[PDB]
Design a protein around this ligand. Structure first.
Ligand SMILES: NC(=O)C1=CN([C@@H]2O[C@H](COP(=O)(O)OP(=O)(O)OC[C@H]3O[C@@H](n4cnc5c(N)ncnc54)[C@H](OP(=O)(O)O)[C@@H]3O)[C@@H](O)[C@H]2O)C=CC1
Ligand SMILES: CCCCCCCCCCCCCC(=O)SCCNC(=O)CCNC(=O)[C@@H](O)C(C)(C)COP(=O)(O)O
Ligand code: SF4
Ligand code: SF4
Ligand code: SF4
Lengths: 156, 80, 287, 114, 208, 176
């Protein structure tokens, strides 16, 4: 079954190519943005994982929603989400963002970013420690390792 | 080509062109507000509709003082 | 019946509503809108997928916290399907690719898929099973599509007889097929009279029929409000859009009404016309 | 009892300012429904505008009428700019149900809403 | 009494007492209270008509300079007919002292829009208009800033509850974000912490 | 006391003005900045290899929200509701019942991981040190359902380790 063999090998190559660099965009509303800039710090690297912090939305591989989502924020957040290529992944960082959090019982606040965009990787904390966020990005990469898109396309 | 009767005829067919008026039933003493069952909301609709039709801005107090088709025609005959 | 299936309070966002719906499909168009309106109703939706979890990921956050649930199914085994329909209030069957594949024809998806799921459903004890079908799918010619759908219609009618066999007309919406082909043109001109029905009235009718009991057993058919020529509709599409073989035969084939079966009026939903929603959806032209 | 009103003397100036504000809303609607690339006919939007005006016609106190005029002027400014987005303008409308009628028996099925 | 309890200066108390007595004597038209707390920060409690005259006096006169403007809020106190309390806060660049000009007001009658003499009061007054509804006649621009546009209710009142009445969610039905009546996921529990037994005997109000 | 800046003048002497002209037309202190940055180039950079080397911490980190139990004994919690009385986002949810024995215990002890700001107030408020902020911080959870702990999840998470928790407490039961 060398057709299946070529499908599996080419799927491994393209998915490793996807998960290799993964340059994000840092949306970053509140102090979770400061902790993201602290995993941009010289101690906890991002060069090593091909991860280039970049404000460009047009080329965003993954998107790290961090800070505190509000009602005034949410349509502009999803407009940022729309002008984005369809292979895309979402890391919800922060207790505020992954379920409302400390401002859960309030007005003007969407109860977590689940109610706007889908979420692949939740990483909790206040702030989620830069070490823990980097672990969450590693488990994001392992989710990219298990995606089987070309397997489903071949045996579709 | 700008007389009183041409302005009254064009006011007549735009009163025909308005939808909720049933029927037109034009008169020099019509008073479409209460004798025809209309609202002051519809009064200001018709006033700024004539403004949209054929000219000048027709401000608020003169929009209030009309309440009547021929009085609109005579106010335009005063203003135009 | 047990508690936490009874309705609770108002509607929306994990207000415990009535039905627990096992949906087959839902990664496509109409199933996605149907999961959307059940999430507005606040109903738990058990959906199995077969594809990558990225598709069910971008249709994931429709529900509230943990309402809808995702699992796996396949078109071969009764064990995975039966495990998906172990505990279900209602179940809907929506499936079908509009071109034959390597491993599936128009036959045996429309034939073999309702057989096994209806088998494990009738051995399972589900209620209000709603099976979709294309309109005017006959024993007659011109489509393996339509004749395999007619065979599936006879199957779902014969075994498990109190299924709501439902059929809309060819629906248009944000991700229509035939209006997209009207956009993806070049040409040719024929004649066919045709009524288009918008998608949200269809899925509102489906959710109302699935939440309203005593309306069971009867097959339903949805009606477009205009019912005029196809080529005039193509001229309308080019006019509103500012620019001057299986799918084209299956739109030129047959479009009629049937006086036998009841439609919109026994449900109480307002019909949205072609013109309003068509002006709403015909974006993406030149400026 | 000394009370200093905003603008009013009787309800004549109230009627005058509210009819001028409605004229401003009439010439406000088509520019905005063309600018925001909206999806609603002009007749429906104008009828919902005049329905929102006809909701609060039961107020005779002139200070309250003055404060309503000032609020409507504020939102007419904030919609004649591009400061408010598509979301707030659709939020004025109700196209997402919200289906709840005022029948007794309908509220008796989905209960505990007297 | 001396360790770990903050000592005070009676000298500053006497200075602020004499100064407040002086201001109360020389603007008799609007002075109702001149109260001095234990730690010497002055409070002047004012009828809602002398806003512009008292602030034009207190900006100048070379005995009370007080150029620095701070907070404005109108502390929502029910069990009154004049509910809201407009609190001007003034700091002297020349004298290093803090005076709190508390003028009282009701729900619907405006105080006289202090932005004419205080250029810092513009967004302060816009904030108070947005959160409360205290109207400000003779003001350049009143808008809603620090709230959503389509939201209304004047939420920092006590009549507005903790959660909002509206709650957004995206839906794919009309392909956009809509507001719904609030469906909380949990209660926001309410702890009856107002314990009895009179922790301060000096602040006892006379009962009936 | 004050020590202010920017009180000088450009010196009118010929040497100082031709030095400022030399910096203007010769690009000197720019190259001095290049020299300083190359001096940081020739250092060894201070990075940590993340999956193998984990960054240092304190014995009093606030992580996992684990539970403890008695020496060969039962559950350390009494359900005395102090942690839910102090929980500043009210993420604790305690419903208590006694069992057939007679000692007072629980039914439902839920931590919302969304609302948990990780203060430490429930650690300081616990009279018997039942709930302890844990040592490890790796949650990284793909689903929002899985971020709502039950009491049995907390007992499994307190029985996956105590020796870390016991070592940290036995080192630092004297400060707090
Ligand atoms: N105008 C119209 O389009 C009308 C359509 N209908 C019917 O409505 C249904 C839904 O239509 P539509 O959304 O446009 O089409 P889709 O192809 O998108 O819907 C079918 C769904 O079932 C899945 N599926 C199909 N075949 C297989 C297979 N062999 N194995 C596994 N999964 C399969 C699809 O992809 P995946 O596997 O990735 O989930 C999808 O989720 C169809 O059955 C169609 O005949 C009826 C009337 C009008
Ligand atoms: C998309 C659509 C655009 C948004 C649609 C909603 C817009 C919301 C606008 C809200 C504005 C209002 O509702 S203010 C309504 C004022 N109502 C009043 O009753 C004011 C007092 N006036 C009166 O009572 C009278 O003038 C009458 C009875 C209203 C008119 O009398 P005329 O006859 O002498
Ligand atoms: S979770 Fe904590 S650190 Fe992050 S935005 Fe909220 S308050 Fe800031
Ligand atoms: S404070 Fe400690 S013992 Fe008391 S209820 Fe909370 S965890 Fe249990
Ligand atoms: S650390 Fe978490 S569980 Fe403990 S009191 Fe704070 S919010 Fe509540």
């Amino acid at each position: 079954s060398r057709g299946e063999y070529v499908v599996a090998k080419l799927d491994d190559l393209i998915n490793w190519a996807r998960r290799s660099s993964l340059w994000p965009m840092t949306f970053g509303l509140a102090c979770c943005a400061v902790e993201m800039m602290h995993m941009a710090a010289p101690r906890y690297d991002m060069d090593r994982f091909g991860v280039v912090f970049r404000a460009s939305p047009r080329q965003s591989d993954v998107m790290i929603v961090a800070g505190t989502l509000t009602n005034k924020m949410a349509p502009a957040l999803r407009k940022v989400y729309d002008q984005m290529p369809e292979p895309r992944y979402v890391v919800s960082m922060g207790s505020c963002a992954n379920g409302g959090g400390y401002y859960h019982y309030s007005y003007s606040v969407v109860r977590g970013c689940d109610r706007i965009v889908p979420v692949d990787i939740y990483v909790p904390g206040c702030p989620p420690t830069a070490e823990a966020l980097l672990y969450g990005i590693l488990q994001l990469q392992k989710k990219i390792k298990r995606e089987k898109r070309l397997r489903i396309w071949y045996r579709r | 080509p700008l007389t009183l009767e041409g302005i009254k005829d064009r006011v007549l067919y735009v009163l025909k062109l308005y939808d909720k008026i049933d029927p037109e039933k034009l008169s020099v003493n019509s008073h479409f507000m209460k004798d025809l069952g209309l609202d002051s909301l519809d009064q200001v609709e018709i006033i700024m509709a004539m403004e949209d039709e054929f000219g000048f801005e027709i401000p608020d107090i003169d929009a209030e003082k009309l309440m009547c088709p021929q009085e609109i025609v005579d106010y335009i005959a005063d203003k135009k | 019946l047990h508690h936490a299936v009874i309705p609770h309070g108002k509607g929306g966002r994990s207000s415990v509503s009535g039905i627990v719906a096992t949906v087959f499909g839902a990664t496509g168009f109409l199933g996605r809108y149907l999961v959307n309106h059940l999430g507005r109703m606040g109903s738990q939706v058990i959906v199995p997928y077969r594809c990558e979890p990225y598709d069910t990921m971008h249709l994931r956050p429709m529900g509230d916290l943990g309402q809808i649930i995702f699992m796996d199914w396949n078109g071969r085994d009764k064990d995975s399907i039966r495990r998906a329909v172990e505990h279900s209030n209602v179940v809907i069957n929506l499936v079908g690719r509009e071109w034959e594949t390597k491993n599936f024809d128009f036959e045996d998806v429309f034939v073999k898929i309702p057989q096994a799921i209806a088998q494990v459903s009738k051995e399972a004890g589900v209620e209000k099973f709603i099976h979709i079908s294309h309109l005017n799918a006959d024993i007659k010619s011109s489509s393996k599509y339509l004749r395999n759908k007619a065979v599936g219609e006879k199957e779902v009618r014969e075994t498990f007889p109190e299924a709501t066999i439902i059929k809309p007309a060819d629906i248009f919406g944000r991700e229509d097929r035939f209006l997209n082909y009207f956009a993806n043109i070049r040409s040719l001109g024929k004649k066919t009279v045709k009524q288009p029905v918008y998608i949200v009235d269809v899925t509102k009718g489906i959710i109302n029929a699935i939440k309203d009991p005593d309306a069971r057993g009867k097959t339903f058919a949805f009606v477009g409000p205009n019912r005029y020529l196809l080529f005039d509709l193509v001229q309308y599409v080019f006019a509103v859009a500012h620019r001057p073989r299986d799918k084209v035969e299956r739109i030129h084939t047959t479009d009629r009404t049937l006086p036998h079966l009841p439609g919109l009026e026994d449900l109480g939903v307002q019909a949205t016309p072609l013109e309003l929603k068509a002006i709403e959806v015909l974006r993406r032209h030149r400026t | 009892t000394s009370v200093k009103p905003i603008f009013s003397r009787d309800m004549n100036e109230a009627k005058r300012r509210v009819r001028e504000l409605y004229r401003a809303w009439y010439r406000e609607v088509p520019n905005t429904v063309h600018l925001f690339q909206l999806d609603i006919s002009v007749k429906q939007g104008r009828d919902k505008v005049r329905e929102m005006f006809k909701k609060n016609a039961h107020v005779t106190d002139p200070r309250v009428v003055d404060l309503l005029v000032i609020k409507g002027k504020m939102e007419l400014e904030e919609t004649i700019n591009v400061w408010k987005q598509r979301t707030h303008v659709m939020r004025f409308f109700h196209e997402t149900e919200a289906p709840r009628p005022k029948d007794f028996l309908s509220k008796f099925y989905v209960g505990h809403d007297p | 009494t001396r360790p770990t309890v903050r000592p005070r200066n009676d000298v500053a108390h006497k200075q602020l007492s004499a100064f407040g007595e002086y201001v109360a004597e020389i603007l008799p038209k609007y002075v109702q209270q001149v109260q001095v707390s234990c730690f010497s920060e002055l409070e002047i409690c004012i009828h809602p008509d002398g806003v512009i005259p008292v602030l034009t006096f207190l900006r100048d006169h070379s005995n009370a300079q007080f150029k620095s403007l701070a907070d404005l809020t109108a502390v929502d106190i029910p069990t009154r007919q004049n509910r809201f309390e407009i609190v001007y806060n003034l700091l002297s660049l020349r004298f290093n002292s803090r005076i709190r000009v508390k003028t009282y007001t009701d729900e619907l009658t405006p105080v006289e829009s202090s932005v004419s003499v205080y250029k810092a009061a513009n967004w302060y007054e816009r904030e108070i208009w947005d959160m409360f509804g205290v109207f400000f006649a003779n003001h350049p621009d009143l808008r809603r800033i620090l709230t959503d546009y389509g939201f209304e209710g004047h939420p920092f009142r006590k009549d507005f509850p903790l959660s909002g009445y509206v709650e957004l969610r995206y839906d794919d039905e009309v392909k956009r974000v809509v507001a719904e009546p609030v469906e909380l996921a949990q209660e926001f529990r309410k702890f009856d912490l107002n314990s009895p037994w009179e922790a301060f005997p000096a602040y006892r109000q006379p009962p009936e | 006391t004050y020590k202010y800046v920017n009180l000088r003048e450009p010196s009118m002497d010929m040497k100082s003005v031709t030095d400022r002209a030399a910096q203007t037309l010769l690009w000197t202190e720019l190259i001095r900045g290049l020299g300083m940055t190359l001096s940081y180039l020739f250092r060894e950079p201070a990075t940590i290899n993340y999956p193998f080397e984990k960054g240092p911490l304190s014995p009093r980190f606030r992580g996992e929200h684990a539970l403890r139990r008695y020496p060969s004994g039962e559950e350390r919690c009494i359900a005395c509701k102090l942690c839910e009385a102090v929980c500043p986002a009210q993420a604790i949810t305690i419903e208590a019942e006694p069992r057939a024995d007679g000692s007072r215990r629980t039914t439902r002890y839920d931590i919302d991981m969304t609302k948990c700001i990780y203060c430490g107030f429930c650690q300081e408020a616990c009279p018997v040190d039942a709930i302890v902020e844990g040592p490890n911080f790796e949650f990284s959870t793909e689903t929002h359902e899985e971020l709502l702990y039950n009491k049995e999840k907390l007992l499994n998470n307190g029985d996956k380790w105590e020796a870390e928790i016991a070592a940290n407490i036995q080192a630092d039961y004297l400060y707090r």
